[PDB]
């Protein structure tokens, strides 16, 4: 199972870890990808999860987009987890660097409630430009299912834990 996670609340846990390495080790039922609406997995968590699948996530995602069109900001889709997980829940948090509404971050986290347990990154954090402290607060106040947060950045992990109310 998951190991080395600090318990933040009844259902939210956090670890300073690369989500790709956590997924390879744990092979959870659901790994969350920090996706964009086009499922173009170029960088950050998406690029790293996709690279770990040898681009199979991108091929599957391109077929999904060709059939269904883009996701909404705040939306999600369930696709294969390939070699990393049973499923990948691709969730689109707002990208603040694109002027996307930060209120959609709560909508994005609501997608996690459809899954009993998830391995996930902090939505809209990192290259998406939102305040990770705010993202963790929205996570804890929105997600009711068991979420194991993998925070790649060590200094950010320390700051998130020490400032947690």
Backbone as JSON Lines, residues from 0, in Angstrom:
{"i":0,"aa":"X","n":[0.84,-1.21,0.0],"ca":[0.0,0.0,0.0],"c":[0.89,1.28,0.0]}
{"i":1,"aa":"X","n":[0.29,2.45,0.27],"ca":[0.98,3.73,0.37],"c":[1.81,3.71,1.66]}
{"i":2,"aa":"X","n":[3.01,4.31,1.61],"ca":[3.86,4.36,2.82],"c":[4.61,5.69,2.92]}
{"i":3,"aa":"X","n":[4.85,6.14,4.15],"ca":[5.58,7.37,4.37],"c":[4.74,8.62,4.21]}
{"i":4,"aa":"X","n":[3.39,8.48,4.21],"ca":[2.51,9.63,4.11],"c":[2.18,10.18,5.47]}
{"i":5,"aa":"X","n":[2.21,11.49,5.56],"ca":[1.82,12.23,6.75],"c":[0.31,12.45,6.66]}
{"i":6,"aa":"X","n":[-0.39,12.15,7.74],"ca":[-1.84,12.32,7.77],"c":[-2.17,13.77,8.03]}
{"i":7,"aa":"X","n":[-2.94,14.42,7.15],"ca":[-3.34,15.8,7.37],"c":[-4.73,15.9,7.97]}
{"i":8,"aa":"X","n":[-5.65,15.08,7.46],"ca":[-7.04,15.07,7.93],"c":[-7.49,13.6,7.94]}
{"i":9,"aa":"X","n":[-8.79,13.35,8.25],"ca":[-9.35,12.02,8.21],"c":[-9.07,11.29,6.88]}
{"i":10,"aa":"X","n":[-9.06,12.05,5.76],"ca":[-8.98,11.43,4.45],"c":[-7.87,11.95,3.55]}
{"i":11,"aa":"X","n":[-7.09,12.94,3.98],"ca":[-6.03,13.51,3.14],"c":[-4.68,13.23,3.76]}
{"i":12,"aa":"X","n":[-3.78,12.65,2.95],"ca":[-2.41,12.28,3.32],"c":[-1.45,12.96,2.36]}
{"i":13,"aa":"X","n":[-0.21,13.21,2.78],"ca":[0.75,13.91,1.94],"c":[2.15,13.35,2.11]}
{"i":14,"aa":"X","n":[2.92,13.34,1.01],"ca":[4.29,12.83,0.99],"c":[5.12,13.63,0.02]}
{"i":15,"aa":"X","n":[6.4,13.79,0.33],"ca":[7.32,14.46,-0.6],"c":[7.81,13.36,-1.5]}
{"i":16,"aa":"X","n":[7.19,13.25,-2.67],"ca":[7.51,12.17,-3.58],"c":[7.12,12.56,-5.0]}
{"i":17,"aa":"X","n":[7.79,11.93,-5.96],"ca":[7.42,12.09,-7.34],"c":[6.21,11.16,-7.54]}
{"i":18,"aa":"X","n":[5.07,11.72,-7.99],"ca":[3.89,10.9,-8.23],"c":[4.15,9.72,-9.19]}
{"i":19,"aa":"X","n":[5.05,9.88,-10.17],"ca":[5.37,8.8,-11.12],"c":[6.05,7.67,-10.37]}
{"i":20,"aa":"X","n":[6.99,8.0,-9.46],"ca":[7.68,6.97,-8.69],"c":[6.75,6.32,-7.69]}
{"i":21,"aa":"X","n":[5.83,7.11,-7.09],"ca":[4.83,6.54,-6.19],"c":[3.94,5.59,-6.95]}
{"i":22,"aa":"X","n":[3.51,5.97,-8.16],"ca":[2.66,5.11,-8.96],"c":[3.38,3.82,-9.34]}
{"i":23,"aa":"X","n":[4.65,3.88,-9.75],"ca":[5.38,2.67,-10.13],"c":[5.53,1.69,-8.97]}
{"i":24,"aa":"X","n":[5.67,2.24,-7.74],"ca":[5.87,1.47,-6.5],"c":[4.55,0.9,-5.97]}
{"i":25,"aa":"X","n":[3.52,1.73,-5.92],"ca":[2.24,1.38,-5.34],"c":[1.27,0.7,-6.32]}
{"i":26,"aa":"X","n":[1.31,1.1,-7.62],"ca":[0.37,0.67,-8.69],"c":[-1.08,0.8,-8.19]}
{"i":27,"aa":"X","n":[-1.46,2.05,-7.82],"ca":[-2.77,2.26,-7.21],"c":[-3.92,2.01,-8.18]}
{"i":28,"aa":"X","n":[-5.14,1.97,-7.63],"ca":[-6.32,1.84,-8.47],"c":[-6.45,3.08,-9.37]}
{"i":29,"aa":"X","n":[-6.19,4.26,-8.8],"ca":[-6.31,5.5,-9.54],"c":[-5.13,6.4,-9.29]}
{"i":30,"aa":"X","n":[-4.46,6.82,-10.37],"ca":[-3.5,7.89,-10.28],"c":[-4.14,9.1,-10.97]}
{"i":31,"aa":"X","n":[-4.07,10.28,-10.35],"ca":[-4.6,11.49,-10.95],"c":[-3.51,12.16,-11.76]}
{"i":32,"aa":"X","n":[-3.89,12.55,-12.98],"ca":[-3.01,13.34,-13.8],"c":[-3.48,14.79,-13.74]}
{"i":33,"aa":"X","n":[-2.53,15.72,-13.67],"ca":[-2.78,17.14,-13.76],"c":[-2.8,17.48,-15.26]}
{"i":34,"aa":"X","n":[-3.96,17.21,-15.88],"ca":[-4.15,17.33,-17.31],"c":[-4.53,18.73,-17.75]}
{"i":35,"aa":"X","n":[-4.41,18.97,-19.05],"ca":[-5.03,20.12,-19.66],"c":[-6.25,19.59,-20.47]}
{"i":36,"aa":"X","n":[-7.09,20.51,-20.96],"ca":[-8.32,20.12,-21.65],"c":[-8.12,19.32,-22.91]}
{"i":37,"aa":"X","n":[-6.92,19.41,-23.48],"ca":[-6.61,18.66,-24.7],"c":[-5.94,17.34,-24.44]}
{"i":38,"aa":"X","n":[-5.68,17.02,-23.16],"ca":[-4.92,15.86,-22.79],"c":[-3.57,15.81,-23.51]}
{"i":39,"aa":"X","n":[-2.93,16.97,-23.66],"ca":[-1.6,17.03,-24.25],"c":[-0.64,16.99,-23.09]}
{"i":40,"aa":"X","n":[0.0,15.85,-22.9],"ca":[0.81,15.61,-21.71],"c":[2.25,16.01,-21.95]}
{"i":41,"aa":"X","n":[2.48,17.32,-21.97],"ca":[3.82,17.82,-22.3],"c":[4.8,17.93,-21.16]}
{"i":42,"aa":"X","n":[4.36,18.5,-20.08],"ca":[5.25,18.78,-18.96],"c":[4.57,18.6,-17.64]}
{"i":43,"aa":"X","n":[5.32,18.88,-16.57],"ca":[4.87,18.69,-15.19],"c":[4.5,17.25,-14.94]}
{"i":44,"aa":"X","n":[3.5,17.02,-14.11],"ca":[3.02,15.68,-13.81],"c":[2.58,14.95,-15.08]}
{"i":45,"aa":"X","n":[1.85,15.64,-15.96],"ca":[1.34,14.97,-17.16],"c":[2.44,14.45,-18.05]}
{"i":46,"aa":"X","n":[3.44,15.3,-18.3],"ca":[4.55,14.9,-19.14],"c":[5.33,13.75,-18.52]}
{"i":47,"aa":"X","n":[5.48,13.76,-17.19],"ca":[6.25,12.74,-16.5],"c":[5.46,11.41,-16.43]}
{"i":48,"aa":"X","n":[4.13,11.47,-16.17],"ca":[3.31,10.23,-16.19],"c":[3.31,9.65,-17.6]}
{"i":49,"aa":"X","n":[3.14,10.52,-18.61],"ca":[3.11,10.03,-19.98],"c":[4.43,9.37,-20.38]}
{"i":50,"aa":"X","n":[5.55,9.99,-20.03],"ca":[6.87,9.43,-20.35],"c":[7.05,8.05,-19.68]}
{"i":51,"aa":"X","n":[6.54,7.9,-18.46],"ca":[6.63,6.6,-17.77],"c":[5.81,5.51,-18.45]}
{"i":52,"aa":"X","n":[4.77,5.91,-19.2],"ca":[3.96,4.95,-19.97],"c":[4.55,4.75,-21.38]}
{"i":53,"aa":"X","n":[5.74,5.29,-21.69],"ca":[6.34,5.13,-23.02],"c":[5.41,5.76,-24.08]}
{"i":54,"aa":"X","n":[4.7,6.85,-23.73],"ca":[3.79,7.56,-24.63],"c":[2.46,6.85,-24.88]}
{"i":55,"aa":"X","n":[2.2,5.71,-24.22],"ca":[0.92,5.03,-24.43],"c":[-0.22,5.89,-23.88]}
{"i":56,"aa":"X","n":[0.0,6.67,-22.8],"ca":[-1.02,7.55,-22.27],"c":[-1.4,8.61,-23.31]}
{"i":57,"aa":"X","n":[-0.41,9.17,-24.01],"ca":[-0.69,10.18,-25.03],"c":[-1.45,9.6,-26.2]}
{"i":58,"aa":"X","n":[-1.09,8.41,-26.65],"ca":[-1.79,7.77,-27.77],"c":[-3.26,7.53,-27.41]}
{"i":59,"aa":"X","n":[-3.49,7.0,-26.21],"ca":[-4.85,6.74,-25.76],"c":[-5.62,8.07,-25.62]}
{"i":60,"aa":"X","n":[-4.95,9.09,-25.1],"ca":[-5.56,10.39,-24.88],"c":[-5.93,11.04,-26.2]}
{"i":61,"aa":"X","n":[-5.07,10.92,-27.22],"ca":[-5.38,11.52,-28.53],"c":[-6.6,10.86,-29.15]}
{"i":62,"aa":"X","n":[-6.73,9.54,-28.97],"ca":[-7.91,8.84,-29.46],"c":[-9.15,9.34,-28.68]}
{"i":63,"aa":"X","n":[-9.02,9.52,-27.36],"ca":[-10.14,10.01,-26.56],"c":[-10.59,11.39,-27.04]}
{"i":64,"aa":"X","n":[-9.64,12.31,-27.28],"ca":[-9.96,13.66,-27.74],"c":[-10.54,13.64,-29.15]}
{"i":65,"aa":"X","n":[-10.01,12.77,-30.01],"ca":[-10.56,12.66,-31.38],"c":[-12.03,12.23,-31.34]}
{"i":66,"aa":"X","n":[-12.4,11.41,-30.37],"ca":[-13.77,10.92,-30.24],"c":[-14.68,11.86,-29.49]}
{"i":67,"aa":"X","n":[-14.18,12.46,-28.4],"ca":[-15.03,13.22,-27.48],"c":[-14.85,14.71,-27.44]}
{"i":68,"aa":"X","n":[-13.78,15.21,-28.04],"ca":[-13.45,16.62,-27.89],"c":[-12.8,16.88,-26.54]}
{"i":69,"aa":"X","n":[-12.44,18.13,-26.34],"ca":[-11.71,18.48,-25.12],"c":[-12.54,18.41,-23.86]}
{"i":70,"aa":"X","n":[-11.84,18.28,-22.74],"ca":[-12.48,18.31,-21.44],"c":[-12.81,19.78,-21.11]}
{"i":71,"aa":"X","n":[-13.56,20.01,-20.04],"ca":[-13.81,21.34,-19.55],"c":[-12.74,21.59,-18.49]}
{"i":72,"aa":"X","n":[-12.39,22.88,-18.26],"ca":[-11.54,23.23,-17.11],"c":[-12.43,22.96,-15.86]}
{"i":73,"aa":"X","n":[-11.92,22.15,-14.94],"ca":[-12.68,21.68,-13.79],"c":[-13.21,20.27,-13.97]}
{"i":74,"aa":"X","n":[-13.09,19.71,-15.2],"ca":[-13.61,18.39,-15.53],"c":[-12.56,17.32,-15.51]}
{"i":75,"aa":"X","n":[-12.98,16.11,-15.87],"ca":[-12.09,14.96,-15.83],"c":[-12.56,13.87,-16.76]}
{"i":76,"aa":"X","n":[-11.7,12.91,-17.0],"ca":[-12.1,11.68,-17.66],"c":[-11.26,10.55,-17.07]}
{"i":77,"aa":"X","n":[-11.8,9.34,-17.1],"ca":[-11.09,8.17,-16.62],"c":[-10.56,7.41,-17.81]}
{"i":78,"aa":"X","n":[-9.25,7.21,-17.85],"ca":[-8.63,6.43,-18.9],"c":[-7.76,5.38,-18.22]}
{"i":79,"aa":"X","n":[-7.04,4.59,-19.01],"ca":[-6.19,3.56,-18.45],"c":[-5.02,4.17,-17.68]}
{"i":80,"aa":"X","n":[-4.59,3.46,-16.65],"ca":[-3.4,3.85,-15.9],"c":[-2.15,3.2,-16.48]}
{"i":81,"aa":"X","n":[-2.31,2.35,-17.55],"ca":[-1.19,1.7,-18.23],"c":[-0.35,0.9,-17.23]}
{"i":82,"aa":"X","n":[0.95,1.13,-17.17],"ca":[1.84,0.44,-16.24],"c":[1.93,1.11,-14.87]}
{"i":83,"aa":"X","n":[1.2,2.21,-14.66],"ca":[1.29,2.98,-13.42],"c":[0.18,2.77,-12.42]}
{"i":84,"aa":"X","n":[-0.98,2.37,-12.9],"ca":[-2.18,2.29,-12.08],"c":[-3.24,1.55,-12.87]}
{"i":85,"aa":"X","n":[-4.35,1.15,-12.23],"ca":[-5.45,0.54,-12.99],"c":[-6.05,1.63,-13.92]}
{"i":86,"aa":"X","n":[-6.32,2.8,-13.33],"ca":[-6.91,3.92,-14.04],"c":[-6.14,5.18,-13.82]}
{"i":87,"aa":"X","n":[-6.22,6.07,-14.81],"ca":[-5.72,7.41,-14.65],"c":[-6.91,8.32,-14.72]}
{"i":88,"aa":"X","n":[-7.11,9.12,-13.68],"ca":[-8.15,10.12,-13.69],"c":[-7.49,11.41,-14.13]}
{"i":89,"aa":"X","n":[-7.76,11.84,-15.36],"ca":[-7.18,13.06,-15.9],"c":[-8.06,14.18,-15.44]}
{"i":90,"aa":"X","n":[-7.54,15.05,-14.57],"ca":[-8.32,16.15,-14.03],"c":[-7.73,17.46,-14.48]}
{"i":91,"aa":"X","n":[-8.58,18.37,-14.96],"ca":[-8.1,19.66,-15.39],"c":[-8.36,20.72,-14.33]}
{"i":92,"aa":"X","n":[-7.31,21.13,-13.64],"ca":[-7.41,22.26,-12.75],"c":[-7.2,23.51,-13.6]}
{"i":93,"aa":"X","n":[-7.68,24.67,-13.13],"ca":[-7.44,25.91,-13.87],"c":[-5.97,26.25,-13.91]}
{"i":94,"aa":"X","n":[-5.54,26.73,-15.06],"ca":[-4.19,27.17,-15.25],"c":[-4.27,28.69,-15.09]}
{"i":95,"aa":"X","n":[-3.76,29.18,-13.96],"ca":[-3.73,30.6,-13.62],"c":[-2.84,31.37,-14.62]}
{"i":96,"aa":"X","n":[-1.78,30.71,-15.16],"ca":[-0.92,31.33,-16.18],"c":[-1.68,31.6,-17.51]}
{"i":97,"aa":"X","n":[-2.89,31.01,-17.7],"ca":[-3.78,31.2,-18.86],"c":[-5.03,32.06,-18.49]}
{"i":98,"aa":"X","n":[-5.06,32.67,-17.29],"ca":[-6.18,33.48,-16.84],"c":[-7.44,32.67,-16.54]}
{"i":99,"aa":"X","n":[-7.28,31.32,-16.3],"ca":[-8.43,30.45,-15.97],"c":[-8.9,30.7,-14.54]}
{"i":100,"aa":"X","n":[-10.22,30.63,-14.32],"ca":[-10.85,30.98,-13.05],"c":[-10.4,30.04,-11.92]}
{"i":101,"aa":"X","n":[-9.74,30.6,-10.89],"ca":[-9.29,29.8,-9.76],"c":[-10.47,29.14,-9.04]}
{"i":102,"aa":"X","n":[-11.72,29.7,-9.14],"ca":[-12.89,29.02,-8.52],"c":[-13.12,27.61,-9.09]}
{"i":103,"aa":"X","n":[-12.6,27.37,-10.33],"ca":[-12.75,26.05,-10.93],"c":[-11.87,25.01,-10.24]}
{"i":104,"aa":"X","n":[-10.95,25.43,-9.32],"ca":[-10.13,24.47,-8.61],"c":[-10.97,23.6,-7.7]}
{"i":105,"aa":"X","n":[-12.01,24.16,-7.07],"ca":[-12.9,23.32,-6.25],"c":[-13.63,22.31,-7.13]}
{"i":106,"aa":"X","n":[-14.12,22.76,-8.3],"ca":[-14.79,21.84,-9.26],"c":[-13.85,20.71,-9.68]}
{"i":107,"aa":"X","n":[-12.57,21.06,-9.93],"ca":[-11.58,20.06,-10.32],"c":[-11.4,19.0,-9.22]}
{"i":108,"aa":"X","n":[-11.28,19.44,-7.95],"ca":[-11.14,18.49,-6.85],"c":[-12.38,17.63,-6.63]}
{"i":109,"aa":"X","n":[-13.58,18.16,-6.97],"ca":[-14.8,17.37,-6.81],"c":[-14.75,16.06,-7.61]}
{"i":110,"aa":"X","n":[-13.97,16.04,-8.72],"ca":[-13.83,14.81,-9.5],"c":[-13.25,13.67,-8.67]}
{"i":111,"aa":"X","n":[-12.41,14.01,-7.68],"ca":[-11.79,12.97,-6.84],"c":[-12.83,12.19,-6.03]}
{"i":112,"aa":"X","n":[-13.98,12.82,-5.73],"ca":[-15.01,12.16,-4.91],"c":[-15.68,10.98,-5.58]}
{"i":113,"aa":"X","n":[-15.45,10.8,-6.9],"ca":[-16.01,9.63,-7.58],"c":[-15.15,8.38,-7.42]}
{"i":114,"aa":"X","n":[-14.04,8.45,-6.63],"ca":[-13.09,7.35,-6.48],"c":[-12.78,7.21,-5.01]}
{"i":115,"aa":"X","n":[-12.87,5.98,-4.49],"ca":[-12.64,5.74,-3.07],"c":[-11.25,6.08,-2.59]}
{"i":116,"aa":"X","n":[-10.22,5.86,-3.43],"ca":[-8.86,6.19,-3.05],"c":[-8.08,6.58,-4.29]}
{"i":117,"aa":"X","n":[-7.27,7.61,-4.13],"ca":[-6.49,8.12,-5.26],"c":[-5.1,8.5,-4.81]}
{"i":118,"aa":"X","n":[-4.15,8.33,-5.73],"ca":[-2.81,8.9,-5.63],"c":[-2.9,10.16,-6.51]}
{"i":119,"aa":"X","n":[-2.55,11.34,-5.99],"ca":[-2.77,12.56,-6.76],"c":[-1.77,13.62,-6.5]}
{"i":120,"aa":"X","n":[-1.63,14.54,-7.45],"ca":[-0.81,15.73,-7.21],"c":[-1.72,16.87,-6.72]}
{"i":121,"aa":"X","n":[-1.12,18.0,-6.27],"ca":[-1.89,19.17,-5.9],"c":[-2.33,19.83,-7.19]}
{"i":122,"aa":"X","n":[-3.63,19.9,-7.43],"ca":[-4.15,20.45,-8.68],"c":[-3.87,21.92,-8.79]}
{"i":123,"aa":"X","n":[-3.56,22.33,-10.02],"ca":[-3.24,23.71,-10.37],"c":[-1.94,24.24,-9.75]}
{"i":124,"aa":"X","n":[-1.18,23.41,-9.04],"ca":[0.09,23.82,-8.45],"c":[1.19,23.65,-9.55]}
{"i":125,"aa":"X","n":[2.44,23.94,-9.21],"ca":[3.53,23.81,-10.15],"c":[3.35,24.73,-11.33]}
{"i":126,"aa":"X","n":[3.52,24.16,-12.54],"ca":[3.47,24.95,-13.77],"c":[2.08,25.51,-14.08]}
{"i":127,"aa":"X","n":[1.01,25.05,-13.36],"ca":[-0.32,25.63,-13.55],"c":[-0.47,27.01,-12.85]}
{"i":128,"aa":"X","n":[0.49,27.38,-12.0],"ca":[0.56,28.71,-11.45],"c":[-0.23,29.09,-10.22]}
{"i":129,"aa":"X","n":[-1.06,28.19,-9.7],"ca":[-1.83,28.54,-8.5],"c":[-0.97,28.39,-7.26]}
{"i":130,"aa":"X","n":[-1.42,29.04,-6.17],"ca":[-0.74,28.94,-4.88],"c":[-0.95,27.5,-4.36]}
{"i":131,"aa":"X","n":[0.12,26.71,-4.16],"ca":[-0.07,25.33,-3.67],"c":[-0.69,25.27,-2.28]}
{"i":132,"aa":"X","n":[-0.46,26.29,-1.42],"ca":[-1.09,26.31,-0.09],"c":[-2.61,26.41,-0.26]}
{"i":133,"aa":"X","n":[-3.06,27.25,-1.2],"ca":[-4.48,27.36,-1.51],"c":[-5.0,26.04,-2.09]}
{"i":134,"aa":"X","n":[-4.23,25.41,-3.0],"ca":[-4.66,24.13,-3.58],"c":[-4.84,23.06,-2.52]}
{"i":135,"aa":"X","n":[-3.92,22.97,-1.54],"ca":[-4.07,21.99,-0.46],"c":[-5.3,22.28,0.38]}
{"i":136,"aa":"X","n":[-5.58,23.55,0.64],"ca":[-6.76,23.92,1.43],"c":[-8.04,23.54,0.7]}
{"i":137,"aa":"X","n":[-8.1,23.83,-0.61],"ca":[-9.27,23.43,-1.4],"c":[-9.4,21.92,-1.44]}
{"i":138,"aa":"X","n":[-8.27,21.2,-1.54],"ca":[-8.3,19.75,-1.52],"c":[-8.94,19.22,-0.23]}
{"i":139,"aa":"X","n":[-8.41,19.65,0.91],"ca":[-8.91,19.16,2.19],"c":[-10.36,19.53,2.42]}
{"i":140,"aa":"X","n":[-10.8,20.69,1.94],"ca":[-12.18,21.13,2.13],"c":[-13.15,20.62,1.06]}
{"i":141,"aa":"X","n":[-12.66,19.91,0.03],"ca":[-13.52,19.44,-1.06],"c":[-13.58,17.93,-1.17]}
{"i":142,"aa":"X","n":[-12.41,17.27,-1.11],"ca":[-12.32,15.84,-1.29],"c":[-12.74,15.16,0.01]}
{"i":143,"aa":"X","n":[-13.64,14.18,-0.11],"ca":[-14.13,13.37,1.0],"c":[-13.58,11.94,0.95]}
{"i":144,"aa":"X","n":[-13.14,11.49,-0.24],"ca":[-12.54,10.18,-0.42],"c":[-11.05,10.22,-0.01]}
{"i":145,"aa":"X","n":[-10.39,9.06,0.03],"ca":[-9.0,9.0,0.51],"c":[-8.02,9.43,-0.53]}
{"i":146,"aa":"X","n":[-7.36,10.56,-0.31],"ca":[-6.41,11.08,-1.28],"c":[-5.0,11.15,-0.71]}
{"i":147,"aa":"X","n":[-4.06,10.52,-1.42],"ca":[-2.66,10.45,-1.1],"c":[-1.96,11.4,-2.03]}
{"i":148,"aa":"X","n":[-1.57,12.55,-1.5],"ca":[-0.95,13.61,-2.26],"c":[0.54,13.42,-2.34]}
{"i":149,"aa":"X","n":[1.07,13.43,-3.56],"ca":[2.5,13.35,-3.79],"c":[2.97,14.75,-4.22]}
{"i":150,"aa":"X","n":[3.81,15.41,-3.4],"ca":[4.34,16.73,-3.69],"c":[5.79,16.53,-4.04]}
{"i":151,"aa":"X","n":[6.14,16.81,-5.28],"ca":[7.5,16.56,-5.76],"c":[8.56,17.43,-5.11]}
{"i":152,"aa":"X","n":[8.25,18.7,-4.98],"ca":[9.2,19.69,-4.49],"c":[9.39,19.62,-2.97]}
{"i":153,"aa":"X","n":[10.63,19.36,-2.52],"ca":[10.91,19.2,-1.08],"c":[10.6,20.45,-0.25]}
{"i":154,"aa":"X","n":[11.07,21.59,-0.72],"ca":[10.86,22.85,-0.02],"c":[9.39,23.2,0.03]}
{"i":155,"aa":"X","n":[8.63,22.91,-1.05],"ca":[7.2,23.15,-1.05],"c":[6.52,22.2,-0.07]}
{"i":156,"aa":"X","n":[6.89,20.93,-0.08],"ca":[6.33,19.96,0.88],"c":[6.49,20.46,2.33]}
{"i":157,"aa":"X","n":[7.7,20.91,2.69],"ca":[7.96,21.41,4.03],"c":[7.09,22.6,4.36]}
{"i":158,"aa":"X","n":[6.94,23.53,3.41],"ca":[6.13,24.73,3.58],"c":[4.63,24.37,3.73]}
{"i":159,"aa":"X","n":[4.16,23.39,2.96],"ca":[2.76,22.96,3.02],"c":[2.46,22.34,4.37]}
{"i":160,"aa":"X","n":[3.35,21.48,4.86],"ca":[3.11,20.82,6.15],"c":[3.17,21.83,7.28]}
{"i":161,"aa":"X","n":[4.22,22.66,7.32],"ca":[4.39,23.62,8.41],"c":[3.32,24.68,8.48]}
{"i":162,"aa":"X","n":[2.7,25.04,7.35],"ca":[1.66,26.08,7.33],"c":[0.22,25.5,7.4]}
{"i":163,"aa":"X","n":[0.08,24.18,7.51],"ca":[-1.23,23.53,7.48],"c":[-2.04,23.81,8.7]}
{"i":164,"aa":"X","n":[-3.25,24.35,8.5],"ca":[-4.11,24.67,9.64],"c":[-5.04,23.47,9.92]}
